[PDB]
Design an enzyme around this catalytic site. Structure first.
Site, PDB file in Angstrom:
ATOM      1  N   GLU A  35      -4.165   6.436  -3.643  1.00 10.82           N
ATOM      2  CA  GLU A  35      -5.345   5.286  -3.936  1.00 10.82           C
ATOM      3  C   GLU A  35      -5.986   5.035  -2.541  1.00 10.82           C
ATOM      4  OE1 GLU A  35      -2.047   2.611  -5.628  1.00 10.82           O
ATOM      5  OE2 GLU A  35      -3.896   1.756  -6.228  1.00 10.82           O
ATOM      6  N   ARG A  66       0.859  -1.187   0.013  1.00 10.72           N
ATOM      7  CA  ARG A  66       0.014   0.085   0.068  1.00 10.72           C
ATOM      8  C   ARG A  66       0.840   1.173   0.040  1.00 10.72           C
ATOM      9  NH1 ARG A  66      -3.401  -2.425  -1.712  1.00 10.72           N
ATOM     10  NH2 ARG A  66      -5.511  -3.211  -0.787  1.00 10.72           N
ATOM     11  N   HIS A 125      -0.795  -0.272  -9.685  1.00 16.32           N
ATOM     12  CA  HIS A 125      -1.637  -1.375  -8.947  1.00 16.32           C
ATOM     13  C   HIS A 125      -2.041  -2.652  -9.940  1.00 16.32           C
ATOM     14  CE1 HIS A 125      -4.561  -1.500  -5.275  1.00 16.32           C
ATOM     15  NE2 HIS A 125      -4.076  -2.749  -5.638  1.00 16.32           N
TER      16      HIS A 125
HETATM   17  N1  LIG Z   1      -0.225  -4.922  -5.180  1.00 17.05           N
HETATM   18  C1  LIG Z   1      -1.261  -5.704  -5.176  1.00 17.05           C
HETATM   19  O1  LIG Z   1      -2.044  -5.751  -6.480  1.00 17.05           O
HETATM   20  C2  LIG Z   1      -1.767  -6.387  -4.091  1.00 17.05           C
HETATM   21  C3  LIG Z   1      -2.175  -7.730  -3.857  1.00 17.05           C
HETATM   22  C4  LIG Z   1      -2.413  -8.176  -2.705  1.00 17.05           C
HETATM   23  C5  LIG Z   1      -2.297  -7.221  -1.340  1.00 17.05           C
HETATM   24  N2  LIG Z   1      -1.843  -6.232  -1.576  1.00 17.05           N
HETATM   25  C6  LIG Z   1      -1.423  -5.390  -0.503  1.00 17.05           C
HETATM   26  O2  LIG Z   1      -0.398  -6.010   0.354  1.00 17.05           O
HETATM   27  C7  LIG Z   1      -0.847  -6.153   1.530  1.00 17.05           C
HETATM   28  C8  LIG Z   1      -0.347  -7.498   2.197  1.00 17.05           C
HETATM   29  O3  LIG Z   1      -1.207  -8.539   1.573  1.00 17.05           O
HETATM   30  P1  LIG Z   1      -0.768  -9.961   2.296  1.00 17.05           P
HETATM   31  O4  LIG Z   1      -1.422 -11.042   1.479  1.00 17.05           O
HETATM   32  O5  LIG Z   1       0.854 -10.387   2.601  1.00 17.05           O
HETATM   33  O6  LIG Z   1      -1.330  -9.725   3.763  1.00 17.05           O
HETATM   34  P2  LIG Z   1      -1.358 -10.742   5.006  1.00 17.05           P
HETATM   35  O7  LIG Z   1      -2.403 -10.285   5.689  1.00 17.05           O
HETATM   36  O8  LIG Z   1      -1.169 -12.341   4.533  1.00 17.05           O
HETATM   37  O9  LIG Z   1       0.034 -10.327   5.774  1.00 17.05           O
HETATM   38  C9  LIG Z   1       0.355  -8.934   6.053  1.00 17.05           C
HETATM   39  C10 LIG Z   1       1.609  -9.382   7.300  1.00 17.05           C
HETATM   40  O10 LIG Z   1       1.963  -8.143   7.687  1.00 17.05           O
HETATM   41  C11 LIG Z   1       2.137  -8.262   9.078  1.00 17.05           C
HETATM   42  N3  LIG Z   1       2.662  -6.948   9.866  1.00 17.05           N
HETATM   43  C12 LIG Z   1       1.373  -6.079  10.288  1.00 17.05           C
HETATM   44  N4  LIG Z   1       2.099  -5.120  10.979  1.00 17.05           N
HETATM   45  C13 LIG Z   1       3.508  -5.258  10.563  1.00 17.05           C
HETATM   46  C14 LIG Z   1       4.502  -4.502  11.221  1.00 17.05           C
HETATM   47  N5  LIG Z   1       4.575  -3.221  11.838  1.00 17.05           N
HETATM   48  N6  LIG Z   1       5.745  -5.208  10.947  1.00 17.05           N
HETATM   49  C15 LIG Z   1       5.864  -6.190  10.342  1.00 17.05           C
HETATM   50  N7  LIG Z   1       4.967  -6.846   9.899  1.00 17.05           N
HETATM   51  C16 LIG Z   1       3.706  -6.357  10.219  1.00 17.05           C
HETATM   52  C17 LIG Z   1       0.849  -8.843   9.735  1.00 17.05           C
HETATM   53  O11 LIG Z   1       1.540  -9.722  10.931  1.00 17.05           O
HETATM   54  C18 LIG Z   1       0.732  -9.814   8.315  1.00 17.05           C
HETATM   55  O12 LIG Z   1       0.816 -11.218   8.553  1.00 17.05           O
HETATM   56  C19 LIG Z   1      -2.384  -6.262   1.562  1.00 17.05           C
HETATM   57  O13 LIG Z   1      -3.005  -5.973   2.791  1.00 17.05           O
HETATM   58  C20 LIG Z   1      -2.963  -5.409   0.441  1.00 17.05           C
HETATM   59  O14 LIG Z   1      -2.846  -4.174   1.057  1.00 17.05           O
HETATM   60  C21 LIG Z   1      -1.339  -5.674  -2.926  1.00 17.05           C
HETATM   61  O1  LIG Z   2      -5.900  -5.842  -2.153  1.00 19.06           O
HETATM   62  S1  LIG Z   2      -5.284  -5.393  -3.269  1.00 19.06           S
HETATM   63  O2  LIG Z   2      -6.104  -5.700  -4.453  1.00 19.06           O
HETATM   64  O3  LIG Z   2      -4.767  -4.047  -3.497  1.00 19.06           O
END
Ligand SMILES: NC(=O)c1ccc[n+]([C@@H]2O[C@H](COP(=O)([O-])OP(=O)(O)OC[C@H]3O[C@@H](n4cnc5c(N)ncnc54)[C@H](O)[C@@H]3O)[C@@H](O)[C@H]2O)c1
Ligand SMILES: O=S([O-])[O-]
Ligand SMILES: NC(=O)c1ccc[n+]([C@@H]2O[C@H](COP(=O)([O-])OP(=O)(O)OC[C@H]3O[C@@H](n4cnc5c(N)ncnc54)[C@H](O)[C@@H]3O)[C@@H](O)[C@H]2O)c1
Ligand SMILES: O=S([O-])[O-]
Lengths: 329, 329
Positions: free
Chosen positions: A266, A237, A292
């Site tokens: 965003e 993000r 994105h």
């Molecule tokens: N670019 C894209 O198209 C895309 C796709 C999917 C997700 N994302 C984004 O990326 C994020 C991560 O996705 P994910 O599937 O890995 O989520 P997830 O929920 O599987 O994992 C995120 C992890 O971050 C950890 N966390 C929270 N605070 C923290 C901190 N201060 N320091 C270290 N770790 C911390 C949590 O313990 C958690 O396990 C999503 O929430 C979304 O915002 C982007």
């Molecule tokens: O969670 S993702 O699609 O930004």
């Protein structure tokens, strides 16, 4: 008759044919995102909704649509959706837990390589017709014998880690929730303090969500830590970094590069968001950007669409949706 | 009188301090490629030469430089150097067998991701300033669940296969010399014939050298076998492919993309090569190009330069160079 399903963005026609015999559909089969007021109109008396990354939902919204029962979201990050209000209004809110992970993991790696190897300029140099063969230039940074630091080790962090296995890098991370020893060991992951992660990594791959704790975590102070020349890659993000602090770190050459699939503009949840990506940032040489597209692989997109739609059919047929984010009696 | 060493391109100060005690240096400490006449003039009475990508040595070059004892090539692919003419003149020809392998494999995987995900266009889109939030566009191809076909599985082919281990792909290959059963097995590699490779891979990665037998091996007919939308990555040599046939295949949409680090115009030993990259190829949106930067990693370049020097020094002291390409009495 049938339950009323709004779909705010274009989906595969195949999905529409599975949803049609159970719902009447209020679709938007275009490449354009409909204004905020337009959506509320469409949902006014809708029972179901399929939402996407541009969609933004608060308390106000839910109150305008009291026949609502389920928001089926086709995404991982639900930071633009107020789950607390959804719960208190008896409204399901579902996400897509796994499918976004790998395609995003792939892109993130590509951005690390592309950033490290000056790929935008390299390609521009070839296309400029002035390529006359090899010259000692575009000297970049490889993964072999580098320290890759991860910030967050959930789905995406792990997927990236699996992918860097044969690359001869030294793997470290900082979590808010540590892994077991079997996994740390088997991925060669070494847990470190957050400050420490920044002051020692050649690459810094972010994989954390946007929430109360994570907003502007990567600040002016933590960027003063990095090895002069380190590369920051952001596929999670925008607002988890301060882009103004990042620009400055670039301009004084402390930061060797920044890459990103996501941006502050965003994140509609916090009203104080930048209205754009800084022209000065976009103009900077030591950058690589994507709009994105982490999950923009066409076979996956179809599966994401399918999942979000199943959740909706499950919710509407009375049942508990397999991927609901919140709890409901 | 110390043996005269001509170095055709710029090298690190450290390599010069390494050599300067042992011989007198004629340098080109500029970013420029010298004219052949200038190189001939400098080498006419030299005992040794450190050669690079732009250099080409045939019998006529050697006839005009009769004092040459060694040509230390700072590269892997020695297609532009007539090995047999060197041998017959009692000149050692040396190369660098392993140092270029890893950074080139990294780059090749970066090219595969980037091409599959429309990275050039995606970035140009974000710099343009047109990004307003997720759209369902720039849809592309991921590695997960794709069949990745390797033409050749020597140093770079193997370093790429190692690096794709956590990527969920199905790996196949064609070779002139097969791996042993246990290496294949570990890497999950299936051995296929060349026409089958071309007929059934979603990604095709070239990892062969240029020689009489591989010249335009990837020709019109072979390309006519690909699955529509197949992606082709060339990190090896330009003339293993026919760039005209490649372009024809892109233009009809049978080839989904071409990414390359190398080009037919670089293959100096070919008298009939194109002199430039066809502007129509440079204009094609489904492409991604790099100016032969496969080993353009900082630490590694120093190491490559050092390997060539060590080889040069060994020959000048009457030893068989460790990395001689040929064998002299
Ligand atoms: N670019 C894209 O198209 C895309 C796709 C999917 C997700 N994302 C984004 O990326 C994020 C991560 O996705 P994910 O599937 O890995 O989520 P997830 O929920 O599987 O994992 C995120 C992890 O971050 C950890 N966390 C929270 N605070 C923290 C901190 N201060 N320091 C270290 N770790 C911390 C949590 O313990 C958690 O396990 C999503 O929430 C979304 O915002 C982007
Ligand atoms: O969670 S993702 O699609 O930004
Ligand atoms: N882009 C760059 O900067 C860069 C860097 C290093 C090397 N290269 C080029 O890539 C080439 C290969 O590199 P390497 O280090 O992997 O070489 P290598 O000699 O280790 O392996 C090449 C393999 O190709 C195989 N081969 C030969 N003919 C074949 C055929 N018809 N079909 C299938 N396989 C065949 C050989 O059996 C060999 O195993 C070099 O010759 C060089 O031209 C480019
Ligand atoms: O061997 S080459 O491609 O530097």
């Amino acid at each position: 008759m049938l339950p009323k399903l709004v779909i705010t963005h274009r989906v595969h026609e195949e999905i529409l044919q599975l949803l049609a015999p159970h719902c009447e559909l209020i679709t938007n089969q275009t490449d354009s995102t409909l204004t905020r007021e337009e959506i509320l109109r469409r949902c006014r008396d809708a029972q179901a909704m399929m939402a996407f990354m541009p969609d933004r939902v608060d308390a106000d919204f839910l109150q305008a649509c009291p026949e609502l029962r389920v928001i089926g979201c086709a995404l991982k990050g639900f930071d633009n959706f107020d789950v607390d209000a959804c719960t208190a209004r008896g409204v399901w809110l579902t996400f897509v837990p796994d499918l976004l992970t790998v395609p995003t993991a792939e892109l993130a790696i590509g951005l690390a390589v592309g950033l490290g190897r000056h790929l935008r300029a390299a390609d521009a140099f070839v296309r400029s017709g002035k390529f006359r063969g090899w010259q000692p230039r575009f000297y970049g940074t490889g993964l072999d014998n580098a320290t890759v630091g991860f910030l967050g080790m959930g789905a995406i962090g792990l997927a990236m880690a699996d992918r860097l296995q044969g690359w001869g890098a030294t793997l470290q991370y900082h979590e808010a929730k540590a892994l077991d020893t079997q996994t740390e060991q088997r991925l060669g992951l070494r847990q470190v303090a957050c400050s420490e992660l920044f002051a020692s990594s050649d690459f810094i791959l972010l994989a954390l969500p946007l929430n109360a704790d994570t907003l502007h975590l990567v600040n002016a102070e933590l960027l003063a830590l990095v090895r002069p020349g380190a590369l920051l890659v952001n596929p999670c993000r925008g607002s988890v970094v301060d882009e103004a602090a990042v620009l400055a770190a670039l301009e004084r050459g402390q930061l060797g590069g920044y890459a990103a699939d996501v941006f502050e503009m965003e994140d509609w949840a916090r009203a104080d968001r930048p209205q754009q990506i800084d022209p000065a940032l976009l103009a900077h040489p030591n950058t690589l950007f994507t709009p994105h597209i982490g999950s923009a692989v066409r076979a996956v997109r179809l599966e994401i669409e399918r999942c979000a739609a199943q959740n909706i059919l499950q919710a509407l047929a009375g049942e508990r949706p397999i991927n609901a984010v919140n709890r409901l009696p």
